[PDB]
């Protein structure tokens, strides 16, 4: 029960629900004011609540029917700040209807709401809805929202509209899918005659959606003005991976070419719509970290954008770069505030009244995240603010205020997560905002698995690795091995994060040890160990996993007979690609194997993922004929295998499995399978998730027990 | 598949001069679309009238 | 319809002849039976929707099962390789469920 409070002002935070009502705190002296009572239970169980920026209205989103990871369309109802008088937000000349997104402004009671891809804005809540933009069309033309590719692949969220700091104009991205190919997903439960569900899913080697940025004012004619991107010959096809208001009328926008090897950062002014090019970044393989928003000061002074500086050997690490408001075209003021064998995960804010830039980074280890503060003047002193101020967690995530005097800190593992208030002046702990006391007692109620770590080194590469044990280990008994990997770029499987899943339950009860080893291509551990997987995605990290197994099979307390693998999404490939027969005698590498929504033909996947790492599709790169485990899964002489995959999957389409199945038919190899008819890939319901958890362990217990 | 169980729906006359043939209208029959996966990169369902 | 109305009468008037015919009534128990289903994706006689509804009911009942699926194949398996694999699969399932 994490409130996840948001700093309204210099000395107050939202303090959302932890065990009921929504209360407002004051940092001055432990002062609490209730803004919303426990009426959300009787308010038709409002799923998500926001407050007006002027703290005068409260918006409730309830009856949500999610369709993607973040597409929580539902019903939005406004209510007075103290309590009472609910009012269902409505589109013009229409009664209550489902809403894609409404949101809130930065100031006043002004609000917007998106219905059937149309944004309608109300400066006054009492004022009825008025037409602001109507170019949007159902499933083809968007405005302020993201389609599938923009929702989960590159932008990693459905937020495609930006509010001006003064609440005067909105900057939204419009997505055109007219030339985007359309794919349908089968329906097996609808009615006597179920019909497929069609949506625009750009596969590899297809036409990506046409994204156009637009700005509309909130008063008067509200004439729309679009921002013209640069016109280099190698970026005509582009993604708007990120955009941020420099000021109330100047905006900073990022453009990543179709080959995603050139990223231009640009300033534009909404008054005339022209864009003034600022800088360009490229690399030998690709671009990375496309959603790090730079911090623009009050006066529009030097923004602090993380980018690839050479950082000596082991690739060009990612460090902050200083750039003035109007750098000279002859030479800019690029300056590496941070420097070391690490990067910055995110930048919080820079103290304009001094030299204190706060950021979450990996200064200690790539697998741990710490809060730190640097000096923007030649001192460049990366002082400890968190720097292991708590004995147990050593994991951190911080959020500052408008003056960044008071900030909230969260541990989140490996111990029970902590939520605390703190200040940058005294670094004193006034009180804990949330302690997870129920989790605190639960972690001692049962026999939690003990965690172990063992760093590995292969060639000139370092690779963290994590192990779990039932904590009641006896040397006489032998425990089987389970290997879980993801391997997707920009991820870190070996992390100290606290979590309860099927792995912990299985380790505790069924008596098995689980091992996770990070391989080549993962981020945060060196950009050289990231770009080397260009067109060679999968082989390097599975070689690393095989080496980890061979360096784990040496234990006297472990047996070679019962070794199992697991994977999901992209790891579904890995969980199938790590089953050879070493030599001729040292066979039976994995007795029982399982995977979730495995991918075998990357050309049947998104262009933004196939082209980005395996090379541009349509050119017959020959990586689309060598990254297919179908030729590798062919042997599988006697090892039985399992596949679990929902029918209505949109992340990795079920076709990926079916084709694979055909190969197995040609391979004449034993396999099992399970399905979930007309179910998404993100498992919104609890019953489905617990059924999957039961099924995976029920499959594993039989393949291990002898 | 269900009543005639025969591939042919026409019958020759004994003298080899005329034919008796059956014409079936399926327009009013509701249509089922069988899903397809192996077909292509953008597989399409096979539609036909399945009462 | 030609098969349904033959043994359950004409539908559309709530004849109350199909509610009890659904197999979901009996598949509730599934205490320890190692159940299994084999189905072709493009079956033109018994639609995949039948197996889908059975799987949904099994998920609701939380039973144990395994599934084998033929990707986009016809009904009677007029391919020698398909028949060979089908007989191999059924022989397998039965031998691993008869092993003592």
């Amino acid at each position: 029960h994490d409130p996840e409070a948001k700093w309204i002002s210099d000395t107050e935070f939202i303090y959302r629900e932890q065990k009921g009502t929504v209360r407002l705190w004051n940092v001055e002296t432990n002062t609490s004011t209730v803004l919303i009572e426990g009426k959300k239970i009787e308010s038709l169980r409002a799923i998500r609540y926001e407050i007006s920026p002027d703290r005068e209205y409260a918006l409730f989103s309830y009856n949500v029917e999610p369709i993607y990871q973040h597409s929580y369309t539902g019903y939005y109802v406004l209510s007075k700040i103290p309590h009472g008088d609910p009012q269902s937000l409505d589109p013009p000349e229409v009664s209550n209807a489902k809403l894609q997104y409404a949101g809130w402004g930065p100031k006043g009671q002004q609000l917007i709401f998106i219905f059937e891809n149309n944004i309608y804005y109300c400066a006054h809540v009492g004022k009825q809805a008025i037409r602001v933009v109507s170019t949007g069309k159902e499933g083809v033309i968007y405005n302020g929202l993201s389609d599938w590719l923009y929702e989960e692949e590159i932008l990693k969220t459905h937020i495609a509209h930006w509010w001006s700091p003064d609440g005067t104009r909105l900057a939204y991205a419009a997505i055109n899918d007219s030339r985007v190919p359309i794919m349908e997903l089968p329906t097996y439960t609808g009615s006597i005659y179920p019909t497929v569900k069609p949506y625009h899913y750009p596969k590899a080697g297809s036409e990506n959606p046409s994204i156009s940025l637009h700005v509309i004012g909130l008063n008067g004619p509200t004439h729309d003005l679009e921002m013209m991107p640069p016109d280099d010959p190698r970026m005509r096809e582009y993604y708007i991976t990120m955009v941020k208001w420099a000021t109330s009328t100047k905006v900073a926008v990022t453009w990543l070419n179709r080959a995603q090897n050139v990223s231009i950062l640009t300033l534009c002014d909404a008054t005339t719509g022209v864009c003034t090019k600022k800088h360009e970044d490229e690399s030998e393989a690709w671009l990375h970290r496309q959603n790090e928003e730079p911090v623009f000061s009050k006066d529009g002074r030097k923004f602090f954008f993380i980018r690839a500086i050479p950082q000596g050997g082991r690739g060009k690490f990612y460090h902050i770069t200083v750039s003035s408001s109007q750098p000279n075209s002859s030479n800019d003021n690029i300056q590496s505030i941070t420097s070391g064998d690490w990067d910055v995960t995110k930048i919080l804010a820079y103290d304009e009244k001094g030299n204190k830039i706060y950021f979450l980074s990996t200064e200690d280890l790539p697998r741990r995240r710490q809060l730190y503060s640097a000096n923007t003047v030649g001192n460049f002193n990366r002082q400890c603010l968190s720097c292991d101020l708590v004995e147990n967690c050593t994991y951190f995530s911080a959020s500052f205020s408008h003056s960044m005097d008071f900030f909230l800190l969260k541990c989140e593992g490996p111990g029970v997560p902590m939520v605390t208030v703190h200040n940058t002046t005294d670094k004193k702990k006034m009180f804990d905002l949330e302690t997870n006391e129920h989790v605190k007692k639960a972690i001692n109620d049962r026999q939690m698995p003990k965690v172990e770590y063992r760093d590995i080194e292969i060639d000139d590469y370092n690779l963290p690795m994590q192990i779990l044990k039932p904590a009641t280990f006896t040397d006489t008994t032998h425990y089987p091995l389970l290997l879980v990997v993801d391997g997707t770029p920009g991820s870190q499987s070996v992390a100290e994060k606290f979590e309860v899943s099927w792995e912990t339950v299985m380790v505790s009860s069924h008596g098995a040890v689980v091992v996770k080893c990070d391989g080549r291509g993962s981020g945060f551990q060196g950009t050289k160990l990231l770009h080397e997987v260009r067109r060679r995605l999968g082989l390097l990290e599975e070689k690393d996993q095989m080496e980890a197994v061979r360096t784990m099979l040496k234990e006297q307390y472990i047996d070679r007979t019962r070794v199992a693998v697991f994977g999901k999404d992209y790891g579904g490939y890995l969980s199938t690609y790590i089953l050879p027969a070493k030599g001729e005698n040292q066979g039976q590498t994995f007795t029982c194997g399982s995977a979730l929504s495995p991918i075998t033909d990357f050309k049947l996947y998104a262009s933004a993922f196939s082209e980005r790492y395996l090379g541009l599709h349509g050119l017959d790169n020959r990586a689309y004929e060598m990254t297919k485990v179908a030729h590798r899964v062919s042997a599988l002489e006697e090892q039985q295998f399992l596949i679990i995959h929902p029918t209505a999957d949109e992340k990795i389409h079920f076709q990926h499995t079916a084709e694979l199945i055909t190969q197995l038919i040609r391979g004449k190899a034993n396999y099992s399978l399970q399905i979930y008819p007309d179910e998404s890939h993100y498992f919104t319901s609890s019953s489905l998730k617990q059924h999957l958890y039961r099924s995976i362990i029920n499959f594993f217990v039989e393949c291990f027990r002898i």
Side-chain angles (χ1 to χ4, degrees), chain A:
Chain A
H1 60 316
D2 211 333
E4 280 313 307
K6 162 204 175 187
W7 285 110
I8 313 168
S9 87
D10 295 333
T11 182
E12 59 205 358
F13 45 92
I14 290 290
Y15 179 68
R16 294 187 195 271
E17 155 160 6
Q18 65 183 177
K19 195 58 67 69
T21 179
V22 194
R23 186 152 29 91
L24 168 53
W25 282 92
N26 296 116
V27 177
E28 289 298 324
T29 298
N30 283 334
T31 297
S32 304
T33 313
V34 161
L35 261 63
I36 298 296
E37 64 165 13
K39 72 174 281 190
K40 303 168 305 179
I41 304 165
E42 41 259 42
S43 302
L44 275 72
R45 181 69 274 171
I47 290 166
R48 293 294 317 280
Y49 52 87
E50 265 295 328
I51 72 159
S52 64
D54 51 358
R55 264 140 293 160
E56 192 274 331
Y57 270 130
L59 170 71
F60 285 173
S61 60
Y62 75 103
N63 194 357
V64 164
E65 308 91 328
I67 66 171
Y68 291 74
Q69 61 157 3
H70 296 285
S71 182
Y72 54 110
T73 69
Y75 291 123
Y76 288 66
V77 172
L78 212 51
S79 185
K80 323 292 167 192
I81 191 67
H83 49 283
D85 206 1
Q87 177 268 329
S88 301
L89 166 52
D90 290 335
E93 287 266 20
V94 186
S95 310
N96 184 12
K98 272 186 43 74
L99 210 68
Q100 312 160 274
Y101 193 29
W104 262 126
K107 279 99 196 171
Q109 73 172 357
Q110 60 182 354
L111 58 88
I112 69 162
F113 68 94
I114 317 172
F115 174 74
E116 63 168 20
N117 279 358
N118 290 323
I119 318 173
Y120 307 130
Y121 161 82
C122 310
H124 307 106
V125 164
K127 182 175 73 175
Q128 295 327 104
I130 62 170
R131 173 82 75 181
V132 194
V133 60
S134 59
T135 65
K137 186 171 69 175
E138 174 48 83
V140 193
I141 315 289
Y142 283 107
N143 46 5
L145 297 183
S146 313
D147 71 352
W148 167 80
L149 185 58
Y150 275 86
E151 171 170 347
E152 68 181 1
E153 189 58 34
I154 60 170
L155 180 57
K156 311 280 278 193
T157 198
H158 74 300
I159 301 299
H161 73 113
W162 283 257
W163 284 88
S164 56
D166 49 345
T168 303
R169 53 187 77 238
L170 274 295
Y172 64 74
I175 293 169
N176 205 329
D177 291 313
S178 63
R179 47 188 164 272
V180 165
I182 170 168
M183 172 164 208
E184 65 274 15
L185 267 297
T187 288
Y188 292 162
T189 315
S191 74
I192 317 289
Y193 283 100
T195 185
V196 297
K197 278 319 166 282
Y199 73 96
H200 302 274
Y201 188 106
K203 293 289 191 87
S206 45
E207 297 92 0
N208 293 118
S210 172
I211 173 160
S212 68
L213 188 57
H214 300 287
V215 158
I216 286 173
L218 297 180
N219 53 354
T222 74
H223 35 77
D224 198 332
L225 280 85
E226 51 87 14
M227 281 54 67
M228 192 56 167
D231 286 318
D232 289 336
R234 62 227 194 283
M235 61 79 71
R236 305 297 175 90
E237 281 61 44
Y238 59 99
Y239 310 137
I240 309 191
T241 66
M242 199 264 290
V243 68
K244 174 55 207 156
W245 292 98
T247 46
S248 284
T249 190
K250 310 182 291 169
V251 67
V253 54
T254 316
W255 313 88
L256 188 53
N257 47 353
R258 188 171 169 93
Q260 62 84 30
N261 54 341
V262 167
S263 178
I264 285 186
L265 188 153
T266 316
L267 272 172
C268 319
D269 47 347
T271 70
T272 187
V274 69
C275 285
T276 59
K277 194 262 188 188
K278 300 169 79 170
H279 199 63
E280 59 187 0
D281 273 330
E282 45 184 58
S283 163
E284 64 264 20
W286 61 70
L287 266 291
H288 193 218
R289 308 280 280 283
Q290 311 298 129
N291 195 257
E292 275 74 357
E293 289 161 353
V295 180
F296 268 83
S297 66
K298 275 301 167 59
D299 61 333
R301 190 61 179 84
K302 39 195 184 186
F303 71 90
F304 292 162
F305 182 76
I306 185 165
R307 82 174 83 249
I309 70 165
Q311 195 59 36
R314 309 232 168 181
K316 43 187 73 173
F317 278 62
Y318 292 165
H319 281 299
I320 306 172
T321 285
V322 171
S323 301
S324 294
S325 169
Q326 272 180 49
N328 303 332
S329 48
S330 63
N331 264 300
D332 306 321
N333 48 350
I334 51 155
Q335 287 306 315
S336 67
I337 284 185
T338 66
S339 52
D341 291 316
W342 60 87
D343 291 331
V344 175
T345 56
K346 67 155 157 168
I347 311 160
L348 307 189
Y350 156 61
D351 194 70
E352 202 148 344
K353 44 176 179 67
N355 45 0
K356 273 300 181 184
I357 175 172
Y358 306 128
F359 40 77
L360 268 287
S361 310
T362 80
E363 274 157 52
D364 50 354
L365 280 74
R367 87 178 192 205
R368 291 132 66 86
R369 269 77 70 192
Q370 296 292 321
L371 172 65
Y372 278 105
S373 88
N375 287 120
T376 49
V377 74
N379 293 325
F380 294 149
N381 192 358
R382 301 182 301 257
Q383 191 188 347
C384 313
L385 262 64
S386 68
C387 183
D388 289 336
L389 62 84
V390 160
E391 68 295 340
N392 284 128
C393 55
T394 62
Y395 200 69
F396 293 98
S397 53
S399 77
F400 279 78
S401 68
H402 304 245
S403 291
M404 311 75 78
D405 52 353
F406 298 112
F407 69 104
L408 302 168
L409 186 150
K410 311 139 187 178
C411 279
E412 295 170 345
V416 169
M418 321 285 188
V419 178
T420 318
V421 190
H422 265 81
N423 62 6
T424 194
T425 72
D426 306 331
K427 280 140 59 175
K428 61 167 184 276
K429 172 167 62 177
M430 294 70 92
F431 75 111
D432 291 331
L433 183 63
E434 177 42 57
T435 70
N436 307 274
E437 51 270 11
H438 312 76
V439 176
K440 291 223 79 168
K441 53 168 172 56
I443 200 168
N444 206 5
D445 283 350
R446 314 303 151 113
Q447 297 180 356
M448 295 296 172
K450 58 185 191 79
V451 66
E452 286 169 39
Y453 316 100
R454 196 166 305 129
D455 281 336
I456 319 295
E457 293 103 310
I458 304 172
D459 268 323
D460 57 299
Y461 315 125
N462 73 297
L463 283 71
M465 181 275 288
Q466 183 176 1
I467 312 166
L468 307 184
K469 262 206 186 62
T472 78
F473 168 72
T474 64
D475 203 1
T476 73
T477 53
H478 286 287
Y479 293 160
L481 185 139
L482 171 66
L483 183 148
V484 168
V485 296
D486 297 355
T488 180
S491 60
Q492 177 193 91
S493 81
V494 182
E496 66 182 1
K497 34 183 71 163
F498 150 75
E499 49 84 20
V500 294
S501 67
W502 70 90
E503 294 160 344
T504 61
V505 175
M506 183 177 176
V507 166
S508 177
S509 290
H510 295 259
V513 293
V514 74
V515 59
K516 283 81 68 177
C517 168
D518 280 355
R520 298 183 184 92
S522 299
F524 304 168
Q525 73 181 330
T527 305
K528 176 58 189 74
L529 189 63
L530 164 69
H531 290 306
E532 81 283 22
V533 298
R534 180 96 180 187
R535 299 177 56 253
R536 197 49 262 174
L537 209 74
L539 171 79
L540 308 183
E541 62 262 19
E542 68 88 19
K543 281 318 166 189
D544 307 334
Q545 299 317 288
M546 171 85 48
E547 180 269 338
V549 176
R550 267 77 171 278
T551 48
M552 201 65 148
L553 287 181
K554 65 198 190 316
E555 311 297 280
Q556 197 65 71
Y557 49 86
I558 199 165
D559 62 304
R560 276 83 179 267
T561 65
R562 308 160 308 180
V563 176
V565 71
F566 181 88
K568 83 180 301 299
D569 291 331
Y570 168 71
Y573 172 85
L574 294 174
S575 183
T576 61
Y577 182 76
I578 300 169
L579 281 73
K582 148 88 169 190
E584 176 203 8
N585 281 283
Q586 184 77 285
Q588 282 67 29
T589 315
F590 285 97
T591 304
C592 60
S594 53
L596 197 147
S597 302
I599 181 169
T600 187
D601 216 345
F602 289 89
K603 60 179 172 65
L604 276 77
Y605 192 74
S607 76
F609 200 105
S610 312
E611 309 170 316
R612 167 144 80 203
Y613 315 97
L614 288 183
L616 267 295
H617 197 230
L619 209 60
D620 194 9
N621 187 249
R622 213 169 55 180
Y624 294 80
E625 298 203 311
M626 79 197 200
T627 49
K628 288 157 56 175
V629 69
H631 84 278
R632 276 265 301 128
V633 75
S634 294
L636 276 296
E637 317 91 310
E638 94 283 2
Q639 311 96 322
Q640 66 86 26
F641 182 76
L642 183 138
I643 298 85
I644 181 159
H645 201 158
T647 300
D649 191 301
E650 52 258 10
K651 184 62 151 53
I652 295 183
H653 279 164
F654 184 38
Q655 188 174 21
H656 272 109
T657 300
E659 194 55 47
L660 168 72
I661 297 169
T662 313
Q663 182 60 66
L664 273 300
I665 308 300
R666 266 86 73 89
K668 291 209 156 299
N670 284 315
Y671 64 92
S672 172
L673 189 150
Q674 271 96 342
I675 50 167
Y676 299 108
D678 292 1
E679 306 306 319
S680 180
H681 189 69
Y682 278 101
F683 302 97
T684 305
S685 174
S686 59
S687 169
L688 182 65
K689 191 180 290 294
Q690 72 181 7
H691 206 307
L692 187 145
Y693 289 137
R694 191 158 88 76
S695 303
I696 189 66
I697 54 181
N698 286 24
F699 161 67
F700 271 132
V701 61
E702 170 78 331
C703 74
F704 281 166
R705 190 255 297 170
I706 177 175

